[PDB]
Amino acid sequence: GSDNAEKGKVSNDDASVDFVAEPVKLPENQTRVAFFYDRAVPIGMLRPGQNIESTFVYQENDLRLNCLLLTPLPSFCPDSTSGPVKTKAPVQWRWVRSGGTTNFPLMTKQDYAFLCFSPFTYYKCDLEVTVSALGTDTVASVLRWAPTGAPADVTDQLIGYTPSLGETRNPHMWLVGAGNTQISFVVPYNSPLSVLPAAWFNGWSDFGNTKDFGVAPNADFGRLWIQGNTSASVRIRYKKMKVFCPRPTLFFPWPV
Amino acid sequence: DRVASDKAGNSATNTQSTVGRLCGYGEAHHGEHPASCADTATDKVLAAERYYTIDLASWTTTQEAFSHIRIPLPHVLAGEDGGVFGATLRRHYLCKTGWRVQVQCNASQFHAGSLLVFMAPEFYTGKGTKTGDMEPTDPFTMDTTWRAPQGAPTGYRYDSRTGFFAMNHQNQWQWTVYPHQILNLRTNTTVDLEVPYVNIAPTSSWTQHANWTLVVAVFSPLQYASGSSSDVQITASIQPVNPVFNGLRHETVIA
Amino acid sequence: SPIAVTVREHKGCFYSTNPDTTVPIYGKTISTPNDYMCGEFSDLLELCKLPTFLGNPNSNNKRYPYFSATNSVPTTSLVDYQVALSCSCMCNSMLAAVARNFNQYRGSLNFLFVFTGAAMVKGKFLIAYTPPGAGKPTTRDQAMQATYAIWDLGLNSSFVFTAPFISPTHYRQTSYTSAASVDGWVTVWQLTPLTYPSGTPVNSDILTLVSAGDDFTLRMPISPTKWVPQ
Amino acid sequence: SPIAVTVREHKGCFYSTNPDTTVPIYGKTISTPNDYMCGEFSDLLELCKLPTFLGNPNSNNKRYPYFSATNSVPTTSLVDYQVALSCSCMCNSMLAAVARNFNQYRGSLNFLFVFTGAAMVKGKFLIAYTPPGAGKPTTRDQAMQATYAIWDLGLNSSFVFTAPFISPTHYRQTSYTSAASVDGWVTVWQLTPLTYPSGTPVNSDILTLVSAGDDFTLRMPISPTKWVPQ
Amino acid sequence: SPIAVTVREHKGCFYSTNPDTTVPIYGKTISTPNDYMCGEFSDLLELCKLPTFLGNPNSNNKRYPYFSATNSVPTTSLVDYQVALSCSCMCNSMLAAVARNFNQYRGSLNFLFVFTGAAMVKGKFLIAYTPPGAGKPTTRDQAMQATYAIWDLGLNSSFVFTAPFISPTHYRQTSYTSAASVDGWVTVWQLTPLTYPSGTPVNSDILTLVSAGDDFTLRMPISPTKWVPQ
């Protein structure tokens, strides 16, 4: 009943307060930050620019890359007054963008679900990654991972007829043979930062304050490089998620 | 009990129509030193721990629902108006602090209207798109004129194109989820807020990040009968809560 | 010796929601300490109880955080919210924003009203909740027969109105997926006219917010029909 | 270290009746409370004991929930049920409807008779059960040599007749799948004529129901030859 | 009986960093005894604390294990190291050599200076550490406003200067992978001129070494961009 919104808050009632009624509440857990975000969701896909026997090289094709950034937020070959520089590794973008004329598909990669619904300012967690084959041919593929901020080491094949990506002390994966088609695994919160920005970082990324405003540095879970004969759908999963400082969700269009 | 006073060093706010002090995240900046810095911090500078009272804006019948002004921190107090606090801040790499604020605005029993006064972490303060670089303009400066709401709050892109949305999007229909209070002409002439220290890191490279923003937004338009005092200002008393400084050096030339 | 195993028909299968973990490839990695942080929360449900704004449509059909009243008793209702998470005037409230990610709900909805007209203004309103079965009310008189409360203006600026959870089933679907369309209506009427003195703005604005009440819960996490902000 | 395993020849195989569970994809979901409910049951067997109607064929060959008798002693039997779940006059009883979903049975069948002729009517019947070996009875006299009971009309309207479970084997097949066709017959005869006064309907109807007796059981769940209702 | 198993989607997959062992094919093999050995160590981190040489560039641009000073007070700085593992003058120190195999660091860097000029020579230096935010210092006067220490020549030949770990984040990236380029600078200035007597070499050389300080740590093992020695 009667109250005062001015003070920053109000009585949070149930039927029994103003009327001859009562609390109808039942136990229920499924609405918890952790449990809720703890399910798999696609953010993009990987397409090999080259064989399992050669030297790897950044490669784009119809918005598809042979390498991808592990973050919920939007990403893509770095943008430029003259167009996204496709000869390079993807980076975090500040907005979502149509692949072409019509809205879909998207040029950018990201967790659309998480974007349309991230009721919070900061978050953190571990990331469980799943890489599933889109094709039906006996697979021969190599996958390389690296933590946020690490050298891409996108150098030349040392050993002929073998995959350059496999040539590293970093965590790499080798998948090959009939029936062997999906890669699954989990990586640690590997960022230099204490917590990550769910949406926006109200500051410059460089000391000169001239560049990339709104994007926090190393605000991601590292990245993936692929090589071999198979393209794959890539999904992420929020492990032991934690969120802070509540904020507004993505706007929804009012009915005409 | 609607009459209250708050002192801070050689400064003191005072009000006869308060509705209490809303304390965000249910807690305050305690002034702890950052575990990320080896050097003993500079703290507890009385001269720097007070209310800096300044002008916010002129409220008129013209402004509509959700029109607003954004005030960035610490930035807005990093220069001259910040006195000793700004002076000390300018000479340190890192600063970690909370904020205690009082927003003031009076009218009369014959005036109508209401404001949403609140504080948000990582809230977009960019003014416009810088022609050439594909970046914002004056992120760290306070709005000098009311800002019109977006019919469809999808944010601001810098690539000069439109479509979908930007990460700097802010959906006003939900602004009350942020720590806030409502300034209602018929009820009160002041609002009192307070926030802790939050951020992507243990302490802040302030020079390049406005982690907190003080926002004043209109809910219901200002209204008054002819003859009624037409001139209505909105001012504010801002105070740094337990500022803690690290990484002393030659002075950053905000100027 | 090796253990003999029976390999189940469902092998090699991947489950988006599999209740189990997978292989760790970068172990013993410390998670950058964040003990300094404040503002943390665990349950999406809480966000639901924070009152946020209802979008009220204008003739030229554009939205306001409120509705208006004056020195008259409009024969019809001032505003009318349809108790239904899917419902549109809520399209943009935290309550609805969270709710669309879940299949079912239970409990009270709380409608919050805030009077922003001048201190010198007075008057009374009649807020009501009408359950289905006899159709939606077309007159204060009818509304008055269902669940209602009188809201009196005065010193205290606001009013919290609770739409009771009255239903055949323990739960209710959160979305207009096919058509039973609703779970009743919340209607706001003038009981007495807004009254006041000369020199006072004749048209007062009443802020309209909505939120999940105390009893309230959501369940079964799902995906909404995908959308694109305008 | 990994555990070494021997992968059995039958891998990847799916079992319609596999004695085990599979993977859960939507856990922690509460099952909508139904504590208010009544009428619940656990054993299909109970349905079996509820007496339901036997379908008795007419000359023009159409069915009745009963049979008729009158002021005479028909040289032949009034009706004759073949103790055999598969059997047709039962085609539509709950007993048979349940039984056709199981391979074997054991125990007593109970035949229930209800006299609906006028209160003023009297008479006696001879109900009998004849086991195989000497062929089905062709005369009351023969029937009288097997298991039988005399049913006397009077105040009490009905009569429960039990076809005893007399058999070589502990169990019996529920279906006419190939041909030993039956397990004996139940035959109903007039002992004395239905007698009565002037002004009374001369032809009385006797309702005929059947059900599983107390001893009775079914086993081995299976599928019936598929059918289509007329 | 065989144990039923659910075969996970990720089968047959190989993990370069898999936290587990594999199959042993030559068991019970004794490892040639080496109990006689000395000089053993367990933590790469220790190698990090052993001070090694900084490579100081000459006009014709070639490197020296040191820098020179004389009877003057150069208006500008004598040398300037950029606190940044990736940084080049350290390119060849054990500290950097180890650090490039790890993604992040934390703690103090220790800069070691050794005066090798003649015993008869004197003078004082001003070593300083400047954190970012106001740009790198361009004058002793400015440097003097940040973290600093005065180094006085005398009987004792050397000096250990600690670049404090002052930072926003608990950790810092070890490599110049994209661009925030640095974490401040270490600058060396003359406070007073090197002074001395006739018959003494006017230009003294100061050995410059660097190493990880006590507080210091590294984490997340990785691979550097591959290289080829000149």
Binding site: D38, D126 | - | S31 | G27 | -
Partner: peptide, 25 residues
Amino acid sequence: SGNEGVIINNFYSNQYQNSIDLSAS
């Protein structure tokens, strides 16, 4: 707390299966 419902849920040691939580102060 999260979406995990398996009993035998250890196999890989805790410290390997998850980032190690540690408080700066």
